[PDB]
């Protein structure tokens, strides 16, 4: 692979390879952009095919964080850590202690968190060496179940969509398909009922269908029948790539708004959607409640404040619709634009010299 | 006595003699190892036969703390203070004020706590001169009854043992002998019932037998009949040296797991046990909940966090079994090994230069 | 190229890729080992056809600094920067400002300095963004002319060298071949002249040849027969690999001692020079007077002190010798050992916890 | 040996045993009294057959520093380090790094310096780990040559001495025996020559004898008759205990004033010298010019200031005299008193609370 | 008046006259002793006969605080502020703002509080200029009603007395006269009933008698009949000087233990009491709960901790009895002795140098 080429292509700032033979640590820290502030991104641990593959994931994921964080209204840049190994067999204390030290060695340019393959336990180990790690506060632990906060954001983003589709933000009367009944989906449903909305639902797990059904009086369909349903809104809240060539054409819904990651199988599908006239609330923006929530910890965790932050998703989605017309582009595309514009505008308007600039670190 | 010889033998770092004629202070501070962090060890006050005896106790106890703290997963070294005198007649304010100053004079290399012969009152006096003392926080005072936390750790260590012996960690159905019904034993029993375990118990004190019996429907035996009992697990939760030549051979239990200190009368007994095939969860590891609990204070006391720390005893015991096979050694021996390996591995993996390393002091 | 594989092979700490599109910055910071202290290593700027080339060089050079700094008795680790680009044509202000920022972002884990392709002007720009740069102090510039010192270093190493070969340590009488007559070489000559020694000298630069002949009654020989001459000592002070298959046999002298880098083409040669009975003073040890000089600045430059540091070369060379007849190993092999031994020994002996450890940064 | 017993007897503050197996470090730091300020005392390295020997010496020497520093008018207490080992053969880098760390770990309660067995090179290594070391400043080295100063100190003390004996304070005319002709002695002589005084001198080193004779028109006598000579003043500047049963009777002079330590073999002698009517200028007071010199460095060395501090010796000697005819006590006894009186008086008068007290550390 | 004479007599440290014409401020700050720590004393504002009178009160009151604070076990010295003026007509903002500044100007040597003639409002004004003022915390305000804490201390001191008189600390069965039914008395009564003690009581105010009577079933007597009552303990909890020539001889009680200030009309009465064999718990020691309570604020107000502090009064009174025999002196006298001894002993045992001594300021 040609690192420098990839880096210049998208103007990445840094790529950091950390190694500790003693503990078996092999990690790649990717820092794409810190224009808005320190880079924040999870640490994922996984078995990797090829070194190149690992490097590529890191790069790719850090750039994504840049976008997500910007669009979420946060004052943070995009970064990501990828640790090469079997999360089920290779972990040890020592390795997270070394990693923590390398992070401390970046002095605030990068802030980590839990992700695929790592836990709060791991984070606690990292935390013995640096404060640049989030999601470990006792305050966050007590009142910080990501779940509800994410769900709250999808909900809010949903309202903006309805308004754009239908003309109003009341979900009262609307029929909504909910694909997947996880912790998030659960809560979203709640939010929905409470509003006077009708639920159609499915999940690979029965028990899940039941709780949801019992609780909120939902109509449970089979997993494959989810797309066909005659309803107003489709909430993909499970796996990604559910929006594709088979499914798209079966869609009865006018609005797509769910918590799942990477909903589209290809950009193409994004354009398809646009051509069909289905209102799509870009996944990365709408499901951001989770990042926004860990980021509040940096200020001294306040549930209530976090929620309020999350509340801005409505405004972000709304603005996304507006950019869409402004340039006659598909939603997914506008998401990117908004992010990009935010970085550029905020930066220009912060170019004045200050001897004591203030930043999200808050002492750390 | 030949101090330097003893010191080199085991590679002690320091031996500190503190004296203040005015107050009558005579104290010995022993610091065995600080590879993992500041040395933490109680201050014991006692009447001493010979100076040499005092010195020997200090040395001996500090080395023990090194092991205990390491095996407990803490980032602390081993130290101990021995004060020569009658705890019942020789104490005065002035002496603890001088001691406190000497401690402050070690600047964080050593952290004290209450132990045999000293109280929270004494600690408060030390605390007027230094912050390197633990167990005195108002937070710790409020929600920090060592008892439950220790008991919780024995309980957890017990589960690891059962699993190793029996094949599963459910104590449901198991019969358990509980020698001693102290504050800790009390709680352990609780934990047990709540799990669906059967209790056989004894204590020199009737009242104790009664409360336990009444409360949890236990079968009370006489003190001397404790060893003979037909049960699965023996929990020595009183005095030490209960595992010996008389008792061992009477054992019906397959698992030994209690809160008492220094269970074995000799290493020999440890080997005996091994030969008999009785699963022994080394005392110092399994009863560590108490140290782990005071150590959390250093982070700003959090009961819930402490418990979670304590939870790792399960993992430590488990690992102890594994080392046992790996080297075909008795449990007691593996405990030491694990500790030792932890020190060495953690150290290697922290050898990278940092201009602002972070440590357990947390400002202090 | 398998980075993690090479890193692991020698246990490299970090590999840092820095990129700045706007400025065209492409650099690689390699940090081999920081056991003894922050990594000190020059920044070089050079043209690279393949990324891999640059990456390898960085890795390679950083590892060398580890050895050089250690052996030199310094409390610094090994690092190096490689800037990909045409020094003659590619430089700009902006690129050095960016690099300076990345370096500040490593917070003292890495200190830079001038090298191939870079000038004090470049370092000055870096200096606007960080204090982690050396060789830029006003005093340094006023009194640390590298040449003079490095020269001094080769001299002393030469004497300790005569010692083992030519019984005594006086240069008196002695006939010395001086291959290469750049600045460092001149001085070596001045020092060599002013001691009662005679010099056969060579070079590609005619002028240069004259200056020496004039200045010091030296016989100018043909650039390609220098090896051949019958001299007491051969001082390679130009290009590398001069010690190979051809020249080695062609060699007369009993001692090898010059300023050049990578004098040996292969270890093989080091190994050959050995049986031969020729006393080869290791390049990296003997020519270290310049690092040492720049390192002093870290304490507030003092030509005097610096010079005194340099003197130590003699003893170092000396020590290399003994380690040779201690394991019966080649000179070049013993340099390595002496270095690795110092690292380990010093690391063990600093394993004690301190809350306010002192380090070379001297509050930088 | 009963440590606590000896400690209590003189109220020693601390006795610190430091050990580092890897380096072979075995040292004892004794801290007698820190009432006036941090303990200042040299570090000596010497061979010891018995631990007890070393322990005793440490204790002994530290107590002496208490007296010396006090009497000298300094705001420093008394301490001393004893490193057990062969200075000629046992030294290494690692051992001094370790010791340096232990010293840093005492946080200013103890300041070190060169002594028997140690060099400025040793102190430099200590210096890499702590600022609690003296006699290593570049300026000190540039302008605080101990000899010159100590010499100066003995001189002045000599004059205040003539004063009480030989009415005036002029050295003019005066015939002086100079036992021992090392550096300090030479100077004493230079100063003594350049004042109109005549010198009968001795030594074991022939060369030395010549230098003085030449340089200053001095009569060289036999090493064993020096006591005998008819001189005005006897200046013992070599070994100790020269004042004993044999020599005392054998003595002619009216004044005793040299640089040597432990001039008296026993107090008994001090007591004897007394009735005799011989004016004995206490060793520790009169030869203190070197401590004073090294102490100045604590403020940022100033030869001038240092020198001026030294002048005070005259007055101190003077004062010792008065305290003599004030209690009708021997010279040597009055030195002690003057010291203890200063400690107490100064301590009482500084008993007022201050939140930001000033101390000699001068932010070290 | 002769200030210096009075000052030397008792060794006062300082007398500070503060003036501000603009606001009309005239204040005298008296600092008697700060051996134990900063001086703490209330600010009293009153109309003063003569300047000399004011000065005399200040002096006199500061010395008293020295004793009280020492005997209470606090690490504080004695001071007092006297402001010349009509508390009912002369106060203004400006004057307390100036005073606050002068206090800040003493930098921690003196800490103020409310007293006769000043309020929390006044303290708040002082607090805008300095932190050296106590009793104004929101925490203290919430849970800091002096009342109960003082009462708790009298209660505890009472138990020590009973034990000395009667042989046991149970007040169960005892009859107790309570002179005065203020907020403190109220609570004390409570404490008493709750213990199974019998109450005899009186107060100039009916309502008071009633509440007490109703609540705790007390026997209310007339004010003048208080002394005659046939009971075990007399608790003077109102005005002082109640112990005199008339009253003393009427006493039926064996123990005197109340909250009132300056119980004795003359020392003489103290001796009388002693001769009569009535056990007297010195007022200033026993009623100290109030000072102890404000002093806890300095640590960050903790009600529970304060109470525990207060608990030591028992121990202080107890010790007072012991000194009484030890020297065959009256109680009142021993109180003073204890205080004095505490100052002297604590000071001696804190004479060791520390570069970073810790103190009650806690940052302030």
Q: Give alpha helix (H) positions in D112-170.
A: 120-127, 138-143, 146-165
In sequence order, which residues have a C-beta less than 8 Å from that of residue D93 and are 6 or more positions away?
C73, C342, C345, C346, D125
Would you call A7 and C13 a contact, using CB atoms and an 8 Å cutoff? no
Question: In sequence order, what are the residues at sequence separation of 6 or more whose Cβ sits closer than 8 angstroms to the Cβ of residue B249?
Answer: none
CA distance E60 to E70: 16
Starting at the edge strand found earlier in the chain, the sheet holding E233-236 runs E219-220, E198-202, E175-179, E233-236, E255-256, E279-280
d(C-alpha D172, C-alpha D198), whole Å: 9
Flag whether C182 is marked binding: yes
Sheet of B219-220, strand order:
B219-220, B198-202, B175-179, B233-236, B255-256, B279-280
Asked if D362 contacts D298 with a C-beta cutoff of 8 angstroms, the reply is: yes
Strand partners, C234: C177, C256
Residues after which chain B is discontinuous, using a C–N cutoff of 2.5 Å: none
Concatenated DSSP letters for D221-280?
A: --TTTTTTS--SEEEE-S-S--BSTTHHHH---SEE--S-SS-BS-HHHHHHHHHHT-EE
Distance CA D259, CA D289 (A): 10
Q: Helix, strand or coil for residue D51? A: helix
Give every CB contact of residue D348 below 8 A, 6+ residues apart in sequence: none
D184-212 burial string, b = 16+ CB within 10 Å, else e?
bbbbbbbbbbeeebbbbbbbeeeebbebb
Identify the chains in contact with E, defined as 3+ C-beta pairs within 8 A: B, D
What are D337's two structure tokens? 């008193």
Nearest to D289 by CA among D177, D171, D120, D145: D145
Which tokens in the block code for residue C311? Answer: 């003197």
Cβ–Cβ < 8 Å for B231, B253: yes
Superfamily of domain covering E134-336: NAD(P)-binding Rossmann-like Domain (3.40.50.720)
> E262: left (phi > 0), else alpha (psi -120 to 50), else beta?
left
Residues 6 or more apart whose Cβ sits within 8 Å of residue E143:
E301, E303
Inspect the interface and report whether the beta carbons of D94 and C356 lie closer than 8 Å.
no
Handedness of CA A323, A327, A332, A333 (dihedral sign): negative
Answer yes or no: are the C-beta atoms of C162 and C168 closer than 8 Å: yes
D135's tokens: 């006699």
Solved with: X-ray
Query: Residue E340 and residue E70: Cα distance in Å, rounded?
Result: 8
Nearest CA distance, A51 vs chain C (angstrom):
7
User: By three-state DSSP, how is residue B19 classified?
Assistant: strand
Using the beta-carbon criterion (under 8 Å), do B34 and C108 form an inter-chain contact?
A: no
Quote the CA–CA distance of E193 and E201 in Å, as a whole number: 13
Residue A11 token pair: 């103007």
Q: Check if D38 contacts E (Cβ < 8 Å).
A: yes
Q: Do C350 and D22 make contact, defined as CB atoms within 8 angstroms?
A: no
CB B108 within 8 A of CB B357: no
Q: Cα torsion for E164, E165, E170, E176, to the nearest 10°? A: -140
Could you give the CA distance from residue E317 to residue E321 in angstroms, rounded to a whole number?
Answer: 7
d(CA A165, CA A159): 10
Q: Is C167 annotated as a binding residue?
A: no
Q: Buried (b) or exposed (e) across E25-51, using 16+ Cβ within 10 A?
A: bbbbbbbbbbbbbbbbbbbbbbebeee
Fold match flag (B1-66+77-133+337-364 vs B134-336): yes
| Total residue length of chain A | 364
Would you call B344 an interface residue with chain D, using a CB distance cutoff of 8 Å?
Answer: no
**CA dihedral over D89, D95, D100, D103, signed as positive or negative:** negative
Residue E358: closest CA among chain B residues belongs to which residue? B129
Nearest to B188 by CA among B199, B173, B174: B199
Beta bridge partners of B233: B176, B255
Give D358: exposed, middle or buried? Use CB within 10 Å, 0-12, 13-18, 19+: exposed
Helices (H), B129-182: 138-143, 146-166
Residue E39 at interface with chain D, using a CB cutoff of 8 Å: yes
Test C19 with A13 for CB contact under 8 angstroms.
yes
What's the CA gap between D229 and B43, in Å, rounded? 63
**What whole-number distance in Å separates Cα of residue C108 and Cα of residue C134?**
12
- Using a CB-CB cut-off of 8 Å, the residues of chain B touching C75 are none
| Burial tier of A358 (Cβ tally within 10 Å: 0-12, 13-18, 19+) | exposed
Chain A residues with CB under 8 Å of C26 CB are: 4, 8
Q: How far is residue D91's CA from residue D99's CA, in Å, rounded to a whole number? A: 12
Coil, helix or strand for D45? Answer: strand
Residue reference for tokens 């782990």: B292
Is A181 annotated for ligand binding?
A: yes
Say how far apart CA E250 and CA A79 lie, in whole Å: 87
Q: Answer yes or no: are the C-beta atoms of C105 and A106 closer than 8 Å.
A: yes
What CATH topology corresponds to A1-66+77-133+337-364? Rossmann fold (3.40.50)
Measure the CA–CA gap between B119 and B101, rounded to whole angstroms. Answer: 18
Residue ranges in chain C assigned as alpha helix (H): 3-10, 51-71, 93-104, 120-127, 138-143, 146-165, 183-193, 206-216, 247-250, 267-276, 283-286, 289-296, 303-327, 331-348
For chain B, give percent helix, strand, coil, nearest 5: 45, 15, 40
B37 labeled binding residue:
no
HEC secondary structure over chain E = CCHHHHHHHHCCCEEEEEEECCCCEEEEEEEEECCCCCEECCEEEECCCCHHHHHHHHHHHHHHHHHHHHHCCCCCEEEEEEEECCCCCCCCHHHHHHHHHHHHCCCCCEEECECCCCCHHHHHHHHCCCCCECCCCHHHHHHCCHHHHHHHHHHHHHHHHHHHHHCCCCCCCCEEEEECCCHHHHHHHHHHHCCCCEEEEECCCHHHHHHHHHHHCCEECCHHHCCCCCCCEEEECCCCCCECCCHHHHCCCCEECCCCCCCECCHHHHHHHHHHCCEECCHHHHCCHHHHHHHHHCCCCCHHHHHHHHCCHHHHHHHHHHHHHHCCCCHHHHHHHHHHHHHHHHHHCCCCCCCCCCCCCCCC
Q: Which of C349, D97, D25 is nearest to B4 (CA)?
A: D25
If you measure CA to CA, which chain E residue comes closest to D346?
E351
- Of D244, D284, D234, the closest CA to residue D268 belongs to D244
Q: By C-alpha distance, which of A144, A99, A143 is closest to A123?
A: A99
Minimal CA–CA distance to B336: which of B79, B64, B154, B80?
B64
C300 neighbors C249 (Cβ within 8 angstroms): no
Query: DSSP 3-state assignment of D285?
Result: helix
Q: Does A20 touch chain B (CB under 8 A)?
A: yes
Domain chopping of chain B, boundaries: 1-66+77-133+337-364, 134-336
Is D32 at the interface with chain B, CB within 8 A? no
Output the six-digit token pair for C287: 């020519």
Give the separation between CA D84 and CA D54, rounded to whole angstroms: 7
Nearest-angstrom CA–CA distance, E199 and E218: 5
Q: Catalytic residue, from E5, E26, E68, E80: name it.
A: E80
Cα A145 to Cα A121: distance, rounded to the nearest angstrom:
16
DSSP single-letter state for residue C226: T
Helix (H) or strand (E) holding A68: helix A51-71
Contact E78, E11 (CB under 8 A): no
Closest CA to E77 of E361, E300, E314: E361
User: Was B239 annotated as part of a binding site?
Assistant: no
Listed in sequence order, the DSSP H helices in B229-330 are 247-250, 267-276, 283-286, 289-297, 303-310, 313-326
The length of chain B, given as a count of residues = 364
Q: Which of B91, B85, B77 is nearest to B33 (CA)?
A: B77
Owner of token pair 């009581």:
E201
Give the span between the Cα atoms of B197 and A128, in whole angstroms: 38
Kindly tell me whether chain B and chain A come into contact, counting contact as 3+ Cβ pairs under 8 Å.
yes
Contact residues, chain D, for B11 at CB < 8 Å = 19-22
Are B133 and B126 in contact, with CB atoms under 8 Å apart?
yes
A80 included as an active-site residue: yes
Cα three-residue angle E1-E6-E10, rounded to 5 degrees: 170
Q: How far apart are CA C64 and CA C263, in angstroms?
A: 14
Q: Which of D13, D39, D353, D359 to mutate to test the interface with E (most CBs of E within 10 A)?
A: D353
Q: Which pairs from C216-224 meet CB under 8 Å and 24+ separation?
A: C216/C189, C216/C190, C216/C192, C217/C193, C218/C178, C218/C189, C218/C193, C221/C177
Neighbours of chain D (3+ CB pairs under 8 A): B, C, E
Beta pairing partners, C78: C33, C40
Give yes or no for a contact between D19 and D25, defined as CB atoms under 8 angstroms apart.
yes
Verify whether the Cβ–Cβ distance C305 to D138 is below 8 Å: yes
Return all residues near E267 (Cβ < 8 A) that are at least 6 apart: E332
Given CB atoms, is C362 within the 8 Å cutoff of chain B? Answer: no
Of D22, D25, D105, the CB nearest to C345: D22
**Does an interface of 3+ CB pairs under 8 Å exist between A and D?**
no
Residues 6+ apart with CB under 8 A from D238: D179, D180, D182, D185, D203, D260
- Asked if C133 and C167 count as a contact pair (C-beta separation under 8 A), the reply is no
């Amino acid at each position: 692979m040609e690192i420098f080429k990839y880096m210049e292509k998208y103007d990445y700032e840094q790529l950091v390879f950390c190694q500790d033979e003693a503990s078996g640590l092999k990690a790649v820290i990717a820092i794409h952009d810190t224009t808005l502030g320190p880079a924040l991104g999870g640490a994922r641990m996984w078995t990797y095919n090829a070194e190149e593959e690992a490097i590529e994931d890191a790069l790719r994921l850090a750039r994504g964080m840049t976008y997500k964080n910007a669009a979420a209204g946060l004052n943070l840049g995009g970064g990501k850590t990828v640790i090469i190994g079997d999360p089920f067999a290779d972990k040890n204390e020592d390795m997270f202690r070394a990693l923590g030290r390398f992070i401390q060695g970046l002095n605030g340019r990068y802030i980590t968190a839990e992700d695929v393959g790592t836990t709060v336990d791991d984070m606690d180990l990292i935390h013995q060496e640096t404060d640049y790690v989030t999601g470990i506060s006792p305050a966050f632990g007590s009142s910080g179940n990501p779940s509800p906060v994410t769900a709250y954001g999808v909900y809010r983003g949903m309202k903006a969509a309805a308004k754009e589709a239908f003309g109003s933000d009341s979900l009262e009367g609307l029929a909504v398909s909910v694909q997947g009944l996880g912790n998030v989906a659960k809560a979203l449903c709640k939010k929905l009922n409470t509003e006077g909305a009708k639920l159609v639902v499915t999940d690979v797990n029965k028990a899940a269908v039941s709780a949801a059904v019992a609780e909120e009086g939902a109509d449970a369909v089979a997993p494959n029948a989810i797309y066909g349903v005659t309803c107003d809104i489709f909430a993909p809240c499970a796996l990604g790539a559910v929006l594709n060539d088979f499914t798209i054409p079966q869609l009865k819904a006018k609005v797509i708004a769910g918590s799942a990651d990477n909903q589209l199988k290809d950009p193409r599908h994004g354009k398809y959607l646009h051509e069909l006239g289905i209102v799509y609330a870009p996944d990365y923006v709408i499901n951001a409640g989770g990042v926004i929530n860990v980021a509040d910890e940096l200020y001294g965790y306040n549930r209530t404040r976090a929620m309020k932050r999350v509340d801005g998703i409505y405004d972000s989605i709304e603005k996304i619709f507006a950019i869409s017309k402004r340039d006659g582009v598909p939603s997914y595309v506008a998401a990117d634009r908004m992010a990009e514009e935010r970085i550029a505008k905020v930066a220009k308007a912060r170019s004045q010299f200050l001897q004591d600039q203030r930043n999200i670190l808050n002492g750390r």
